[PDB]
Amino acid sequence: TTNDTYEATYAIPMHCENCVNDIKACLKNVPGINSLNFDIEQQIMSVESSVAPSTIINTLRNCGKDAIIRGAGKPNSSAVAILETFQKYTIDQKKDTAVRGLARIVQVGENKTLFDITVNGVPEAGNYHASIHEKGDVSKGVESTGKVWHKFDEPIECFNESDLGKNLYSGKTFLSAPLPTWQLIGRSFVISKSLNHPENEPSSVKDYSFLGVIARSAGVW
Amino acid sequence: DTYEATYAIPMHCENCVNDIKACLKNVPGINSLNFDIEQQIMSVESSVAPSTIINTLRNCGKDAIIRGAGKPNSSAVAILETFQKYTIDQKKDTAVRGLARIVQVGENKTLFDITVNGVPEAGNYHASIHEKGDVSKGVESTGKVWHKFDEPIECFNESDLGKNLYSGKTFLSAPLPTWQLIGRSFVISKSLNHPENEPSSVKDYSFLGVIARSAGVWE
């Protein structure tokens, strides 16, 4: 049925001669694809299929191609959330900025959203967890954002060395949810992990979290 | 054009409710006034300009604050911050310079409680809503002006927060339901008086924030 098929746009470097040809060979045997359309100039590929974006992205990765979700210019379809800490932590000594992550969001189809999540510069290595809280009021940090509205089960593994600090960690993950962008905007995107040593935190806080309001975006990244 | 709006007003004193009623007694266009003494909130149903109710209460020495009425996706807030260094702005303890409290009170009517505090240059500031709430690059990434508010925010009052800084406040109304506003950016700006002294070659002093869903409860 029509609700089973949808449109998704990906940014993929394709200036080289065999560039487009290799991408076509890469996806030729993937079941469920109705069409692949390329825009060499903009270096983007539009895919109409019943194939989960993680699959398209996963397959492209298997072909050595880095595909990044991108907005297709349709109204209220793309969003972004700049994730920052909202309090001091004994373990977090990075003072230049409070930003620790970024969530890029694009809606594909009527009730499907893909989340390109990046974490960079956290002081404690480990598995981080993402969720969307009901409100986007960050006047009091996570406290003012209300209850968990959507929980993502897939952890964000952060064990890589950060390019922001030799002693910091980074991680990346790609998630999806059966939600449209209009239900996400204005809410808060939160990533957190239980502190390894809460005793040393005078804040009496138990979790290390960074979050941001989900904002409308052009999706041109 | 009748609509209902809720306001938080201190009303626990002996003559508190009676003084408010006396205050609004002669305002033409009020259909009903509902006082919830426990919660200290007053719901007003009228065909009167929202500013008329706010200004009238002000003339009676009463501070009315807009309050969300609990209907889905009706209240929002935007914490306004600068996103770049300004020669004239030496306040480093925080980038926060303002706040917009938003409450939808009608099918096509929304009220905005706008506060500015701590700006280095006195003057008239202007509010607008930009298309995107993306602040990955300050106002630049927020795209084009989506809605422009004609009423300025007069900032000439002495700031309670700082030395030689200014503050101001404005109450506005616009035919823009909250669902159209969330996720976009609320921007307040004023032309810099002396752009030459600004090495960033910027021309406007601006502070902004993403419009976020809120419970609608403020002080």
User: ∠ CA(A26), CA(A60), CA(A54), 5° rounding?
Assistant: 125
Cβ atoms of B48 and B30 within 8 Å: the answer is: yes
CB-based contacts of A217: which residues, under 8 Å, 6+ apart?
A: A71, A78, A79, A80, A104, A105, B132, B133, B134
Smallest Cα–Cα separation from B127: which of B141, B147, B109, B108? B147
Minimal CA–CA distance to A84: which of A131, A125, A127, A138? A138
Which 85-144 residues of chain B touch chain A by CB within 8 A?
131-136, 143
In DSSP notation, A34-73 reads EEEEEETTTTEEEEEESS-HHHHHHHHHHTT---EEE--S
Residue A163 in tokens: 């390019």
With beta carbons less than 8 A apart as the criterion, state whether B104 and B110 touch. yes
What is the distance between the alpha carbons of residues B36 and B12, in angstroms, rounded to a whole number? Answer: 10
From A22's Cα to the closest Cα of chain B, the distance in A is: 34
Binding residues of B: 12-13, 16
The A68-70 sheet, strands edge to edge: A33-39, A44-49, A6-11, A68-70
- In this complex, the residue of B134, B185, B213 whose CB is nearest that of residue A187 is B213
Spell out the domains of chain A, with CATH numbers in brackets. 1-70 (3.30.70.100), 71-221 (2.60.40.200)
| Closest Cβ–Cβ partner in A79, A135, A213 for B215 | A135
Distances (CA, A) of A213 to A104, B184, B192, B209: 12, 10, 29, 9
B31 phi/psi in degrees, rounded to 5:
-85, -40
Helix axes A19-27, A53-62, angle to 10 degrees: 120
Give this entry's resolution in angstroms.
Answer: 1.8
Q: Rounded CA gap, A130 and A175, in Å? A: 10
**Closest residue to B79, CB basis, from A76, A139, A146:** A139
Phi and psi angles of residue B207, each rounded to the nearest 5 degrees, phi first? -135, 140
- Considering only CB atoms, B184 lies closest to which of A146, A187, A216, namely A216
CB contact (8 A) between residue B183 and residue A188: no
Q: Round to whole Å and give the CA distance between B75 and A102.
A: 26
**Count of all residues that appear for chain B in the document:** 219
| A-proximal residues of B, 13-52, CB under 8 Å | none
The CA–CA distances, whole Å, from B111 to B5, B178, B217 equal 9, 10, 14
Contact: A216, B76; criterion CB under 8 Å: no
Q: CA of B39, closest CA in chain A: separation in Å?
A: 20
Rounded CA-CA distance B67/A107 in Å is 33
Q: What is the DSSP letter of A86?
A: -
DSSP string, B84-141: S--TT----S--EEEEEEEEEEETTEEEEEEEEEEESS-EEEEEEEES----EEEEGG
Which are the contacts of B5, defined by CB distance < 8 A and separation ≥ 6? B43, B44, B50, B53, B66, B69, B103, B105, B111
Q: A54 CB contacts (<8 Å, ≥6 apart)?
A: A114, A174, A176
Report the alpha-carbon distance of residue A192 to residue A92 in Å, rounded.
13
Experimental determination approach used: X-ray
* Residues of chain B neighbouring A139 (CB-CB closer than 8 A): 77, 79
Distance from C-alpha of A93 to C-alpha of A187, rounded to nearest angstrom: 28
Chain-centre distance for alpha carbon A46: 19
**Contact residues on chain B for A80, CB-CB shorter than 8 A:** 134, 136
Residue A108 has, within 13 A of its CA and on its CB side, a CA count of 26
Residue A59 to residues A13, A23, A24, A28, Cα–Cα distance (Å): 15, 10, 11, 11
Long-range contacts of A162-165 (CB under 8 A, 24+ apart): A162/A120, A162/A121, A162/A122, A163/A120, A164/A94, A164/A120, A164/A121, A165/A94, A165/A121
Residue B212 bridge partners (DSSP) = B77
Tokens standing for residue A201: 């935190």
Q: Which residue has the tokens 């956290």?
A: A122
**A15 labelled binding-site residue:** yes
Report in angstroms the alpha-carbon separations of A82 from A100, A112, A191, B39, B98.
8, 21, 11, 36, 20
How many other β-carbons are positioned within 10 Å of the β-carbon of residue A3? 9
Q: Is B56 helix (H, G, I), strand (E, B) or coil?
A: helix
Give the three-class secondary structure for B203: coil
The dihedral through the CA atoms of B173, B175, B177, B181 has a sign that is: negative
Query: The tokens of B42 are what?
Result: 């007053």
CA proximity to A126, closest of A76, A96, A190, A170 = A170
Judged by a CB distance cut-off of 8 A, whether residue B58 touches chain A is no
CA distance A187 to A132: 7
